[PDB]
Amino acid sequence: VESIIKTATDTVKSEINAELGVVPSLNAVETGATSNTEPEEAIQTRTVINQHGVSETLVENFLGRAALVSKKSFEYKNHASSSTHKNFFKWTINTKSFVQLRRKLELFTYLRFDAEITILTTVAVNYMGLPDLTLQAMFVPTGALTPKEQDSFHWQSGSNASVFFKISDPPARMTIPFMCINSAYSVFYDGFAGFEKNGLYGINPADTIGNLCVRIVNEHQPVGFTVTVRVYMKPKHIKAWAPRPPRTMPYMSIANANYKGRDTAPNTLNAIIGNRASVTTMPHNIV
C-alpha cells in the first residue's frame, strides 16, 4: 500500500460500461472507508499524463515555516521605582499563544521535530538615537531556576545555553533538538500530568520545551526605551501522526481547547458555515 508519489496520478481513457454485477459508483459509507470510485468508472475519460508536483504539501514543508510564537515588549530604563519587567523577562515556551501556528500543529495528534529558533529585537525611544544594545537569551529547563534581576549572578550561565546578540546584528538563531522524554511530542493530551486528582488537564509537562530568559546586558541609559523581543519557531526533520479535525471555534486559552464561538456565523457554535437563504439558493450565482 505504501509507495513513492512525486506527481498527481495520471488518467487513463475509459470506454462505455454496461456490465451486470459491476457498480463502481455505489459504495457503503458505513464501512468507514472512503469511496473508491475512480473518474474512469464514473464518466468516459481521456488519457492525461499528469505532471503536477506534490512536494509543496509534504509535511516537512507544510509545517516548515518560521512562525511567531512569542512577542514581548518591556521598558529598558532605571527601574528604581517600578512595581513589571525590569530590563528582562522570562517566558515559559509554548506553541499555543499565536493561532496560525497553533492551528496547524493541532492538525496532528503527535509530532516529532527539531526546532529552529530565531530571535528578532526592536527598539524605540520613549528623539536622539537608537542604542545598539546587547541582549542575552538563556535557555532554562522547564520549571528550573530563573533569574530574578537583570544583574542576578544566575546569568553567569555555567551550564545553561546562553546566546548573546546585538540589535544591529541579524536576528539570533539556534536549533533546539527534539527534546521530549517520549518518542514524539503530544499536541493533544487526554490526561492529567500528576498522580493526584487536582492536576491540570490536557497539559503534559513532557511537551514543554522550557523557559527562555531574556535580558538587556547593558546597564540602563539616562533615558527609557521600549524594547520588543519576537521569537519565531520553525520545526524541521518532521514526523507526524494521526491527522485531526481542524479548529473551527476561536481559541479562548493557551491552556485548553475551551470554546465559545463567534457572536454570529461564520464559526459560531451553532453554525460554522455562513448561512444562505435555502438549500436551493445558489450563492454567487452567475447572472
Binding site: F188, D190, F192, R244, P246, T248, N256, N258
Partner: protein
C-alpha cells in the same frame, strides 16, 4: 460474506449478521511490546485470556433528542474484571482494543450513528476559560455525554471526525460497528489511571425516527482489551 462476523477472544464471542466489514485503525493490528522498543526492564505479566476478552458496558438509550455518548479507554474498564485488577495492581499497562458497538431496530426505523475512535481526545469546556476538571473527564464504565457534538466538545468539528478510525451504524444497512485499535501513544507503556489513549464516541448525526410502534432502542458497547501487558507490580490503588 462481509455482512456476517464472529469475534472470539478468551471465553467470549460475539456474532453479527448485519455488519459492514470492519475497521483496523490506521491499518494496524495489536501486538505485544518488542524488545527493541521496551523501556521498563522488569519482566511483564501477560495474563492473556483473563484480560483479553469482551467486557460489555451498561447500555444507553437512543432518544429522539440524544446528543451522543463517549467512553474513554482504559478508564471505562479500569474497574472491570481481571483487566481492572491488573490495572490497579500495576503502575504500567499497555494494550490494544477490539470495539464492537451494537444497535438494532426495525425495517421501519431510520437513524445514523457515527462510531469513531478518537486518539488523545482532549475535551474542552464551553464558554469559560477554566479547564475541565477530573470529574468532567473520568466517567468510568458509565461514560459521558456530548454537550456540543457539532464541534466534538473540543472546538473542532464532527464533520471532519471521519479523519479518525470509524464506521457508521445506519439502521437501514447494519446493526453493528467494529473497530480494532492498536496501542496508540508516544510511549511504549503508560500509567492507566491518569491518561486515556482512546475515546470511543457514538454520535447520532441523523436522529432516530419512525412512525411504527415506539420502542426503547438501546446502544450497547462491548470492548475487548488485546495483547495486555502490565509492569511495575505493587499494591492496589
Amino acid at each position: 460474506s462481509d455482512r456476517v462476523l464472529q469475534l472470539k477472544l478468551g471465553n467470549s464471542a460475539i456474532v453479527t449478521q448485519e455488519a459492514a466489514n470492519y475497521c483496523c485503525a490506521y491499518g494496524e493490528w495489536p501486538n505485544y511490546l518488542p524488545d527493541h522498543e521496551a523501556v521498563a526492564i522488569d519482566k511483564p505479566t501477560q495474563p492473556e485470556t483473563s484480560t483479553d476478552r469482551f467486557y460489555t458496558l451498561r447500555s444507553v438509550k437512543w432518544e429522539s433528542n440524544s446528543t451522543g455518548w463517549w467512553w474513554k479507554l482504559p478508564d471505562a474498564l479500569n474497574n472491570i474484571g481481571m483487566f481492572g485488577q491488573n490495572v490497579q495492581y500495576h503502575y504500567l499497562y499497555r494494550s490494544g482494543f477490539l470495539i464492537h458497538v451494537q444497535c438494532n431496530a426495525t425495517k421501519f426505523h431510520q437513524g445514523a450513528l457515527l462510531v469513531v475512535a478518537i486518539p488523545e481526545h482532549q475535551r474542552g469546556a464551553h464558554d469559560t476559560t477554566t479547564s475541565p476538571g477530573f470529574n468532567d473527564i473520568m466517567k468510568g464504565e458509565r461514560g459521558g455525554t456530548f454537550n456540543h457534538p457539532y464541534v466534538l466538545d473540543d472546538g473542532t468539528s464532527i464533520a471532519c471526525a471521519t479523519i479518525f478510525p470509524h464506521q457508521w451504524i445506519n439502521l437501514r444497512t447494519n446493526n453493528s460497528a467494529t473497530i480494532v485499535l492498536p496501542w496508540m501513544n508516544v510511549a511504549p507503556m503508560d500509567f492507566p489511571l491518569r491518561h486515556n489513549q482512546w475515546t470511543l464516541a457514538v454520535i447520532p448525526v441523523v436522529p432516530l425516527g419512525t412512525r411504527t410502534m415506539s420502542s426503547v432502542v438501546p446502544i450497547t458497547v462491548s470492548i475487548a482489551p488485546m495483547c495486555c501487558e502490565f509492569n511495575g507490580l505493587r499494591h492496589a490503588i
